[PDB]
Design an enzyme around this catalytic site. Structure first.
Site, PDB file in Angstrom:
ATOM      1  CG  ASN A   8      -1.972   1.106   1.132  1.00 25.27           C
ATOM      2  OD1 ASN A   8      -1.877   2.027   0.319  1.00 25.27           O
ATOM      3  ND2 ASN A   8      -3.003   0.988   1.960  1.00 25.27           N
ATOM      4  NE  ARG A  83      -6.371   0.319   0.152  1.00 26.16           N
ATOM      5  CZ  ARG A  83      -6.879   0.287   1.377  1.00 26.16           C
ATOM      6  NH1 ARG A  83      -6.229  -0.346   2.346  1.00 26.16           N
ATOM      7  NH2 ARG A  83      -8.035   0.886   1.636  1.00 26.16           N
ATOM      8  CG  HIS A 172     -13.529   2.683   3.132  1.00 25.76           C
ATOM      9  ND1 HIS A 172     -14.235   3.754   3.640  1.00 25.76           N
ATOM     10  CD2 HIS A 172     -12.277   2.782   3.641  1.00 25.76           C
ATOM     11  CE1 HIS A 172     -13.443   4.470   4.419  1.00 25.76           C
ATOM     12  NE2 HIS A 172     -12.250   3.901   4.435  1.00 25.76           N
ATOM     13  CG  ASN A 203      -8.037   7.497  11.802  1.00 21.40           C
ATOM     14  OD1 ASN A 203      -8.186   8.482  12.528  1.00 21.40           O
ATOM     15  ND2 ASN A 203      -7.301   6.448  12.156  1.00 21.40           N
ATOM     16  NE  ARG A 233     -10.615  12.234   4.333  1.00 25.98           N
ATOM     17  CZ  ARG A 233     -10.298  10.973   4.068  1.00 25.98           C
ATOM     18  NH1 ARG A 233     -11.134   9.996   4.403  1.00 25.98           N
ATOM     19  NH2 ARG A 233      -9.150  10.689   3.465  1.00 25.98           N
ATOM     20  CD  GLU A 378      -8.921  -2.208   4.043  1.00 23.35           C
ATOM     21  OE1 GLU A 378      -8.872  -1.280   3.207  1.00 23.35           O
ATOM     22  OE2 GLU A 378      -8.817  -2.034   5.280  1.00 23.35           O
TER      23      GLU A 378
END
Ligand code: ANP
Ligand code: ANP
Lengths: 394, 394
Positions: A8, A83, A172, A203, A233, A378
């Site tokens: 990632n 990813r 996601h 998060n 956010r 994941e």
């Protein structure tokens, strides 16, 4: 004993894991942080932040490659999983990386400037370091490519969609895909005839409606900024309000963009932290703004969970996942109690169990909708895709 | 035979109605359009666009005052009702207008620049023209003042709320208030123990959750731009997307603000019209983008209706109102079929009836939630408030 190397590559780091192809278990994990900085380190399993100050993405991956070799792993790496942050409308599933795929990932990168380019850097380095190894790309957006136009279109003039490609994408996707697959088994549902709502709460947070195995609605938009309120956010925000603020404080879209992405959400409201654990304690101690940040967070999650259910013909289950969804006993209960309208009935003793209990049901029998917690994986989902593609002839 | 004079002073016009205090029936209606323009006219009941070119708000109201006198109405005007666009956090109910109220309306005007000032102009003129007559103000925002912080807070830094007053306010409060009151009777519900979702669908559109007679959630935000997609308004829009567009087309927040408010929604997607009647025909004729604009519109309404239901302990009814909610047989059915998840069952023959049938139920018995159409009457709601306040001693 072949293994899969999952990567990632982020804007400022490189997370990686080496899973056994047989059991999909993690044999080694790590992360190269402080990338492109005059001070960059690499902490494997956390035994020694190595040194590689002033090193690019390929050097960082080289350090990683050496550690795999120092542990005689290098020779068992049969697949590499990448990813990818954004796949635009070009990717609907995971693919074997070829020159064409690279070109295509490059074509959609404008949809995720920072992130996607880091992803390409990682692919470029991985290709250099493991030439004879098959490599695949897994896009965080592909699972949501099944959404109908009515669900991905914004109410903006048509030109913005057709010309500039402005539409909802969602993220996601890998977690939502992985978690929903697991739900069919835990809840003994028939994928082809089912309705699930998955709440990936970390998060970064988002909701997703999976109708008969397909994603039909998701909360994030063209970017990860829309939908639920998150750690830093804001989540959905009235554009009129953003416009009003600008004229009031003389700030620009960039100024405001940074505030909405880095200074809002749990952090912004609590004025304390973006970490739920910190705020949960704060509230327990009587902190008023922490209680408000959490209540607002809970209220927006319930609102989107219910709204997304409208895209289902029947609601069979609500699945909680992610750092928050898997570990927050309080948030889960609050969200669920805020959805009594849907006929949900919580089993507190079940909801009290720690994440060590894995995939578990937390709703009582009388409940009209099953509620459960399913830890997301994941890296495993990516490895599984890679394994599948490992049997293909390219 | 006393009457009430209701006034809606807008940015470019003045809508008015004279209702009988006894039956609350309309005895006269009209509108002075093209305000502040070199060409301003006044069309009463539509028999003769009078002339008043280059006339201010008070002149326009003077023309109106003369027509009431020419019809011997001037002497029966016992009350005057003023519609106020924004009441900030200062107004929670309708009030008798005094110097204090004017000052307060002026204090919150920054929350609705254009609109509120026009409202004050109208009050100033009405006060000049009918000195001995009691006058009251009805704010489109007061009904939503019962929302909890968790429901009206944005995920922006706390300072924006506490300092700049940025929070959700909501609109169509008078319609939502009026329609929900009517629903308690039509559905034979106990206000104190009830859950309704009202869908005010007109050129401007919004959803509202009324729990036990109180508004606990509504779709518009600090401004009328948030929530549902509307005639020319986009509705919820990912801020990240708006920011991305700006950098892409070099447009400013003002440029984008105008597009979101005046060129989006049904108009923006269909690239045909903001009028549902026009688009419904267009689709019937095979227009693809009209079908998409309508489907998107329907999808977003269903999503917010379901989401708002999360603020109720029990869903007893879903009420459709407004120019679209009262007259669109197609939209009502599509929204309702898009909410099968909530257990809604539509009675097509009932849903087929024209608005001439007034307050009516459109769901079948097997339906878990009652669905109905209730024509809104904001002028009547205002007059009723005025009548109530007419018995007070100031
Ligand atoms: N035991 C716990 N109780 C409550 N909250 C927890 C716990 N453990 C982690 N969290 C919270 O959940 C968050 C981290 O979620 P997580 O899914 O691990 O991170 P993330 O990978 O960076 N999210 P995203 O980047 O979009 O995939 C933090 O806000 C934590 O406070
Ligand atoms: N018979 C009909 N069938 C379908 N749509 C209709 C019909 N009559 C009116 N509409 C639509 O509903 C809209 C007008 O709604 P309405 O509530 O009267 O207006 P408005 O007062 O300007 N909205 P708002 O300004 O925010 O209060 C138009 O889009 C019309 O096409």
């Amino acid at each position: 004993f072949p293994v899969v190397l999952v990567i990632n590559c982020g804007s400022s780091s490189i997370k990686f894991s080496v899973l056994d192809v047989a059991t999909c278990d993690v044999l080694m994990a790590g992360i190269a942080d402080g990338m492109n900085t005059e001070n960059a380190f690499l902490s494997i399993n956390g035994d020694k932040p190595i040194n590689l100050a002033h090193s690019n993405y390929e050097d960082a991956l080289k350090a990683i490659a050496f550690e795999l070799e120092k542990r005689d792993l290098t020779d068992s790496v049969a697949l590499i999983g990448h990813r990818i942050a954004h796949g635009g409308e070009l990717f609907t599933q995971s693919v074997i990386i070829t020159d064409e795929i690279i070109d295509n990932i490059r074509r959609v990168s404008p949809l995720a400037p920072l992130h996607n380019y880091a992803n390409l850097s990682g692919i470029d380095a991985a290709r250099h370091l493991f030439p004879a190894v098959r490599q695949v790309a897994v896009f965080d957006t592909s699972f949501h490519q099944t959404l109908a136009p009515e669900a991905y279109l914004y109410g903006l003039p048509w030109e913005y969609f057709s010309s500039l490609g402005v539409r909802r994408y969602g993220f996601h996707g890998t977690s939502h895909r992985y978690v929903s697959r697991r739900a069919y088994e835990l809840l003994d549902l028939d994928e082809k005839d089912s309705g699930l709502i998955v709440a990936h709460l970390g998060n970064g947070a988002s909701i997703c409606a999976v109708r008969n195995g397909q994603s039909v609605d998701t909360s994030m938009g063209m970017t990860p900024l829309e939908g639920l309120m998150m750690g830093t956010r804001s989540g959905d925000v009235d554009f009129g309000a953003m416009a009003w603020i600008a004229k009031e404080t003389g700030q620009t879209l960039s100024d405001l963009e940074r505030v909405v992405n880095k200074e809002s959400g749990l952090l912004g409201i609590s004025g304390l932290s973006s970490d739920l654990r910190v705020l949960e304690k704060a509230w327990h101690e009587g902190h008023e703004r922490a209680r408000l940040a959490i209540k607002t967070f809970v209220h927006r999650i319930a609102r989107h969970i219910a709204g997304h259910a409208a895209s289902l013909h029947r609601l069979d289950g609500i699945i909680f996942t992610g750092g928050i969804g898997e570990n927050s006993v309080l948030i889960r209960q609050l969200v669920i109690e805020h959805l009594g309208v849907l006929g949900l009935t919580l089993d507190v003793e079940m909801n009290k169990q720690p994440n060590s209990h894995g995939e578990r049901i937390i709703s009582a029998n009388p409940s009209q909708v099953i509620c459960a917690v399913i830890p997301t994986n994941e890296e495993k989902m990516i490895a599984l895709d890679a394994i599948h593609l490992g049997n293909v002839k390219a």
